Design a protein around this ligand. Structure first.
Ligand SMILES: [Mg+2]
Ligand SMILES: [Mg+2]
Ligand SMILES: [Mg+2]
Ligand SMILES: [Mg+2]
Ligand SMILES: [Mg+2]
Ligand SMILES: [Mg+2]
Ligand SMILES: [Mg+2]
Ligand SMILES: [Mg+2]
Ligand SMILES: [Mg+2]
Ligand SMILES: [Mg+2]
Ligand SMILES: [Mg+2]
Ligand SMILES: [Mg+2]
Ligand SMILES: [Mg+2]
Ligand SMILES: [Mg+2]
Ligand SMILES: [Mg+2]
Ligand SMILES: [Mg+2]
Ligand SMILES: [Mg+2]
Ligand SMILES: [Mg+2]
Ligand SMILES: [Mg+2]
Ligand SMILES: [Mg+2]
Ligand SMILES: [Mg+2]
Ligand SMILES: [Mg+2]
Ligand SMILES: [Mg+2]
Ligand SMILES: [Mg+2]
Ligand SMILES: [Mg+2]
Ligand SMILES: [Mg+2]
Ligand SMILES: [Mg+2]
Ligand SMILES: [Mg+2]
Ligand SMILES: [Mg+2]
Ligand SMILES: [Mg+2]
Ligand SMILES: [Mg+2]
Ligand SMILES: [Mg+2]
Ligand SMILES: [Mg+2]
Ligand SMILES: [Mg+2]
Ligand SMILES: [Mg+2]
Ligand SMILES: [Mg+2]
Ligand SMILES: [Mg+2]
Ligand SMILES: [Mg+2]
Ligand SMILES: [Mg+2]
Ligand SMILES: [Mg+2]
Ligand SMILES: [Mg+2]
Ligand SMILES: [Mg+2]
Ligand SMILES: [Mg+2]
Ligand SMILES: [Mg+2]
Ligand SMILES: [Mg+2]
Ligand SMILES: [Mg+2]
Ligand SMILES: [Mg+2]
Ligand SMILES: [Mg+2]
Ligand SMILES: [Mg+2]
Ligand SMILES: [Mg+2]
Ligand SMILES: [Mg+2]
Ligand SMILES: [Mg+2]
Ligand SMILES: [Mg+2]
Ligand SMILES: [Mg+2]
Ligand SMILES: [Mg+2]
Ligand SMILES: [Mg+2]
Ligand SMILES: [Mg+2]
Ligand SMILES: [Mg+2]
Ligand SMILES: [Mg+2]
Ligand SMILES: [Mg+2]
Ligand SMILES: [Mg+2]
Ligand SMILES: [Mg+2]
Ligand SMILES: [Mg+2]
Ligand SMILES: [Mg+2]
Ligand SMILES: [Mg+2]
Ligand SMILES: [Mg+2]
Ligand SMILES: [Mg+2]
Ligand SMILES: [Mg+2]
Ligand SMILES: [Mg+2]
Ligand SMILES: [Mg+2]
Ligand SMILES: [Mg+2]
Ligand SMILES: [Mg+2]
Ligand SMILES: [Mg+2]
Ligand SMILES: [Mg+2]
Ligand SMILES: [Mg+2]
Ligand SMILES: [Mg+2]
Ligand SMILES: [Mg+2]
Ligand SMILES: [Mg+2]
Ligand SMILES: [Mg+2]
Ligand SMILES: [Mg+2]
Ligand SMILES: [Mg+2]
Ligand SMILES: [Mg+2]
Ligand SMILES: [Mg+2]
Ligand SMILES: [Mg+2]
Ligand SMILES: [Mg+2]
Ligand SMILES: [Mg+2]
Ligand SMILES: [Mg+2]
Ligand SMILES: [Mg+2]
Ligand SMILES: [Mg+2]
Ligand SMILES: [Mg+2]
Ligand SMILES: [Mg+2]
Ligand SMILES: [Mg+2]
Ligand SMILES: [Mg+2]
Ligand SMILES: [Mg+2]
Ligand SMILES: [Mg+2]
Ligand SMILES: [Mg+2]
Ligand SMILES: [Mg+2]
Ligand SMILES: [Mg+2]
Ligand SMILES: [Zn+2]
Ligand SMILES: [Zn+2]
Lengths: 141, 69, 110, 181, 53, 77
RNA sequence: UCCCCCGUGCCCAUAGCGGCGUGGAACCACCCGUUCCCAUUCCGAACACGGAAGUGAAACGCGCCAGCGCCGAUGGUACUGGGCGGGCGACCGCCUGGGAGAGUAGGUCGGUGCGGGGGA
RNA sequence: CGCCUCCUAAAAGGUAACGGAGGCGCCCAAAGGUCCCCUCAGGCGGGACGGAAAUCCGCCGGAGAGCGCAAGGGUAGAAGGGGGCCUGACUGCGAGGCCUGCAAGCCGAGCAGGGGCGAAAGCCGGGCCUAGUGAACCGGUGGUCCCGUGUGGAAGGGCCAU
RNA sequence: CUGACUGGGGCCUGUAGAGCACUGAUAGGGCUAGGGGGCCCACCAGCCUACCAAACCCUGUCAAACUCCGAAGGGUCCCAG
């Protein structure tokens, strides 16, 4: 599942989740989209569960585009140690996601299929979601 | 040129094996060489030196036509 | 993408301007040799001299010297004494040296 | 300047034929030889016996001009190269000397090459320059068997004011460079 | 400074006084330093020599 | 459990010490910097560590000459 | 005071790259030579001297063209000094003042100072 | 556990945590001063041994290379590369500042002495820069010839340098 | 009368935001060195790949120790309340 092949730094300070998404707000490849309604660190495992469920719905067919990527390392202190003695170990990777972002798109599939896969995928993600379909507003960006 | 580091060039005759003499310049006045452009096979038309063969092989054996038909 | 000539020119000129003197700049063509003394504070030429303008003769070096002398004379006439020699892209030698030496005989201070 | 046969041949035979062949509108547009730069990549003298004063001598006999040394721009492991090491010679022939060199290359050296079947047609730079390599220096009339400790070749760059290969082939060919195809 | 990069004094060869302290590498520069320096005593430049610190 | 980190150096208090329009005396330091972020201009010296300082009494002025860099001048009084 | 050129600056790419055209009377260059001054880790390529047969081919100057490069609104938004609200929170909104970056329209194949030389 | 560079640090300075990452405890007689000259990495094409990469030629190539070592800033209109002469890697001082609880640390025009380079303008009081360090006490060595326990010396000390 | 604070004016700055030109990360596609694999062969070259995939390009992104950009503010000096 998704993680950087290499990085300049092993650990990142946590930062903030303020604002609407910087970019990535319009459908850009496929026909239907899953857009984030609230901010979160989406984990690599959560992403992979969304993906796997979608290919599972399609059985064979369709194309899934994953548009968010987990490059933020997530740190945790070993169980039961006290505060201090330096930063915790990287235990996983997250993709920071703000409201408005198209996290996933699908193409090559019926409408009822794109809706359903995106719904099931939604249930794997720890935030609220909206399914969208490509508009002229998308195409003009 | 800088003085004292360069071999002086003077008029010089290179004498080839075809009996040609070339009036040029060298660090040596007279030179004898085994070959030159004037007599060299590649240069001289297309002097086919020792093998004017026409292959000769392979159809071209012809010893002979005496096997019957 | 500059050339040795453009770099060299800069490299010497920059070092001269830094001292703040009036700049005696010398241009040397294949045939002629020109000189202007420039105030870089004002971006203004104050005094000129050329072989071209003096309709001068033959041996380039001797000519140089003459324009040097000519330069100085119009120069002291204006109150100019001190100045800094801008050999530009030119080695200080030959025609330029000659130009310099003449401006020196003429009483220009450098 | 020297009257040398090849120089004359250029002005007399080659200049005109060329103008005919390409219809130049200006005398300066017709192709000239600019420089012949001879190089010895060597480096068999890296540490070993950097008495390649023997080669510098040989080269200076061939050209009538003393080569200057080339030394390594960077350190190299697998070739065993400390930076600053003397690994080659280069002599830049121009004008009269360039002509004399070529005169004898064309008349005598190339002929003496083993199994010579003509210069390479495709060694053209693509901006109208030509390059060719020799394997031995016994090719030149000035270097006899008696005088050589070891076989070493060289790189020859012939530089031309022509803009295109197509023009350069012409100049060099007309001058007498023998091409295999 | 190290066992090989040593400290040393320079002495007016004319007046014998040590006037400058400095350093050198004795593997790269085994010969005793000789430098022209201003001698404040002799009041002029004087060849100065490395003398043990 | 421990850190291999933990260190940092003293801050160096760098930057411009006198801004345009400010009156200065000869010797006043005008800029403290690493390398040449500002270059010495008219009536301005540069110390070995790139420190810009006033050569004469006067008023400071800054100048942005595009690709030529930025300059600190002191214009006499 | 206008036009061309030669120097030398300033603005610091709206000045650049590329393509095309153009100039040699003057000037500039290439050019012709390497005795002489000077010079090549080799080379009269460079630097340098002495020249004046040729050519504007190279270079340079001057024009033109928007493929690239560079510049770039207006509108709107992000964000925000200050003042208010809301949410358990992650966070979200309102008032007043300021206001980007991206992008769009569009612009650009420079402008100008001083001094020389030539022309009207 | 001291020192340097970056981030955290909220666009002046400063700013903590057993917060995130690295370095120093040297070095260079040139790797220093000055005069003069030169310009990179990399890509494509061309070239004997010769290769991804040795040296050579061509065209493109503003800096992505170099700058002894970490990092950052800086930098080809050189701080990079080559050469010639050199020792300013001065002595006596030092206007005025940076920084700052103190003590320290830092930058420094200018005058004098005697020099180096340069035709000159001028530059040179080490090194592109920021780490490469240690107060006092006690003592060593060279100098000075200042004190010398009634007096002349001497012992011993002061002073300058280390 | 010099103060906090305020008005005007200059200068300094690299954060918010944003961006991707640098350093790195990045999904997909295109183009295309390099391998894996399959035809065909050891005379050394060919050919085909819905395989992994460098550089480059396009679409779309990410960053305390990235910045082609870049605010609001802040600091400082001058005049004035
Ligand atoms: Mg935190
Ligand atoms: Mg979590
Ligand atoms: Mg955590
Ligand atoms: Mg902790
Ligand atoms: Mg942790
Ligand atoms: Mg996790
Ligand atoms: Mg987002
Ligand atoms: Mg859910
Ligand atoms: Mg966009
Ligand atoms: Mg070819
Ligand atoms: Mg050519
Ligand atoms: Mg022979
Ligand atoms: Mg000392
Ligand atoms: Mg530890
Ligand atoms: Mg830490
Ligand atoms: Mg501090
Ligand atoms: Mg601190
Ligand atoms: Mg710090
Ligand atoms: Mg500042
Ligand atoms: Mg200094
Ligand atoms: Mg320094
Ligand atoms: Mg201004
Ligand atoms: Mg001013
Ligand atoms: Mg002009
Ligand atoms: Mg002008
Ligand atoms: Mg002006
Ligand atoms: Mg024409
Ligand atoms: Mg043109
Ligand atoms: Mg003419
Ligand atoms: Mg004519
Ligand atoms: Mg002679
Ligand atoms: Mg004579
Ligand atoms: Mg010549
Ligand atoms: Mg002539
Ligand atoms: Mg032309
Ligand atoms: Mg020119
Ligand atoms: Mg814009
Ligand atoms: Mg607006
Ligand atoms: Mg508002
Ligand atoms: Mg607020
Ligand atoms: Mg507003
Ligand atoms: Mg902004
Ligand atoms: Mg804008
Ligand atoms: Mg137009
Ligand atoms: Mg343009
Ligand atoms: Mg005019
Ligand atoms: Mg310490
Ligand atoms: Mg800070
Ligand atoms: Mg900061
Ligand atoms: Mg700060
Ligand atoms: Mg702040
Ligand atoms: Mg302070
Ligand atoms: Mg600790
Ligand atoms: Mg450590
Ligand atoms: Mg040296
Ligand atoms: Mg140095
Ligand atoms: Mg030197
Ligand atoms: Mg190259
Ligand atoms: Mg190659
Ligand atoms: Mg080969
Ligand atoms: Mg090669
Ligand atoms: Mg670099
Ligand atoms: Mg290291
Ligand atoms: Mg001397
Ligand atoms: Mg003080
Ligand atoms: Mg203090
Ligand atoms: Mg002196
Ligand atoms: Mg003096
Ligand atoms: Mg002298
Ligand atoms: Mg001084
Ligand atoms: Mg150094
Ligand atoms: Mg240092
Ligand atoms: Mg110290
Ligand atoms: Mg004690
Ligand atoms: Mg004690
Ligand atoms: Mg004591
Ligand atoms: Mg007594
Ligand atoms: Mg006494
Ligand atoms: Mg007694
Ligand atoms: Mg007695
Ligand atoms: Mg006594
Ligand atoms: Mg006695
Ligand atoms: Mg005593
Ligand atoms: Mg004593
Ligand atoms: Mg003392
Ligand atoms: Mg008042
Ligand atoms: Mg006040
Ligand atoms: Mg106040
Ligand atoms: Mg105010
Ligand atoms: Mg941000
Ligand atoms: Mg990027
Ligand atoms: Mg883009
Ligand atoms: Mg962020
Ligand atoms: Mg930051
Ligand atoms: Mg940032
Ligand atoms: Mg303010
Ligand atoms: Mg203000
Ligand atoms: Mg008041
Ligand atoms: Zn023959
Ligand atoms: Zn003395």
């Amino acid at each position: 599942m998704l993680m950087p092949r290499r990085m300049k730094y092993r650990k990142q300070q946590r930062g903030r989740l303020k604002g609407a998404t910087k970019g990535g707000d319009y459908v850009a490849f496929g026909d239907y989209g899953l857009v984030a309604l609230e901010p979160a660190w989406i984990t690599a495992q959560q992403i992979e569960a969304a993906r796997v469920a979608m290919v599972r719905h399609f059985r064979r067919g369709g194309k899934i585009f994953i548009r968010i990527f987990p490059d933020k390392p997530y740190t945790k202190k070993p169980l039961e140690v006290r505060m201090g003695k330096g930063k915790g170990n990287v235990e996983g990777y997250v993709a920071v996601v703000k409201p408005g972002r198209v996290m996933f798109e699908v193409a090559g599939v019926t409408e009822e299929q794109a809706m359903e896969a995106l719904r099931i995928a939604g249930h794997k993600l720890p935030i609220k979601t909206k399914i969208v379909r490509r508009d002229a507003y998308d195409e003009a960006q | 040129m800088k003085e004292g580091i360069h071999p002086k060039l003077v008029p010089a005759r290179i004498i080839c094996g075809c009996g040609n003499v070339i009036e040029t310049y060298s660090t040596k006045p007279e030179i004898y060489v085994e070959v030159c452009s004037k007599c060299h096979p590649f240069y001289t038309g297309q002097q086919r030196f020792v093998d004017t063969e026409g292959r000769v092989e392979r159809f071209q054996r012809r010893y002979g036509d005496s096997y019957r038909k | 993408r500059l050339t040795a000539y453009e770099r060299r020119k800069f490299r010497v000129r920059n070092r001269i301007k830094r001292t703040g003197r009036l700049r005696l700049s010398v241009f040397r063509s294949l045939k002629h040799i020109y000189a202007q003394i420039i105030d870089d504070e004002k971006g203004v030429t104050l005094v000129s001299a050329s072989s071209l303008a003096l309709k001068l003769k033959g041996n380039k070096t001797e000519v140089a010297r003459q324009v040097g002398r000519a330069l100085a004379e119009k120069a002291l006439a204006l109150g100019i004494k001190q100045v800094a020699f801008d050999r530009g892209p030119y080695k200080y030698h030959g025609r330029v040296k000659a130009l310099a030496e003449g401006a020196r005989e003429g009483g220009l201070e450098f | 300047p020297l009257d040398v046969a090849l120089k004359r041949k250029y002005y007399e035979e080659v200049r005109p034929e060329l103008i005919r062949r390409f219809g130049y509108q200006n005398v300066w547009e017709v192709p000239r030889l600019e420089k012949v730069v001879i190089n010895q990549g060597l480096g068999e003298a890296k540490e070993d016996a950097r008495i390649l004063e023997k080669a510098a001598q040989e080269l200076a006999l061939i050209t009538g001009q003393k080569p200057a040394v080339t030394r390594a721009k960077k350190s190299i492991s697998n070739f065993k190269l400390r930076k600053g090491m003397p690994i080659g010679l280069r002599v830049t022939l121009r004008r009269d000397r360039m002509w004399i060199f070529l005169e004898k290359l064309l008349n005598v050296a190339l002929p003496r090459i083993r199994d010579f079947r003509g210069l390479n047609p495709n060694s053209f730079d693509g901006r109208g320059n030509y390059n060719l390599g020799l394997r031995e220096q016994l090719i030149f009339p000035e270097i006899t068997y008696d005088m050589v400790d070891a076989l070493r070749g060289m790189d020859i760059a012939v530089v031309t004011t022509a803009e295109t290969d197509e023009e350069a082939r012409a100049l060099l060919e007309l001058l007498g460079f023998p091409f295999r195809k | 400074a190290s066992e090989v990069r040593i400290k040393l004094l320079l002495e007016c060869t004319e007046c014998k006084r040590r006037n400058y302290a400095t350093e050198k590498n004795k593997r790269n520069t085994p010969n005793k330093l000789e430098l022209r320096k201003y001698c404040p005593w002799c009041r002029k430049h004087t060849v100065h020599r490395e003398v043990k610190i | 459990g421990s850190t291999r980190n933990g260190r940092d150096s003293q801050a160096k208090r760098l930057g411009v010490k006198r801004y345009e329009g400010q009156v200065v005396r000869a010797g006043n330091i005008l800029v403290r910097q690493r390398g040449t972020r500002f270059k010495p201009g008219k009536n301005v010296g540069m110390g070995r560590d790139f420190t810009l300082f006033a050569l004469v009494d006067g008023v400071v002025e800054f100048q942005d000459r595009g690709r030529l860099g930025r300059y600190v001048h002191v214009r006499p009084l």
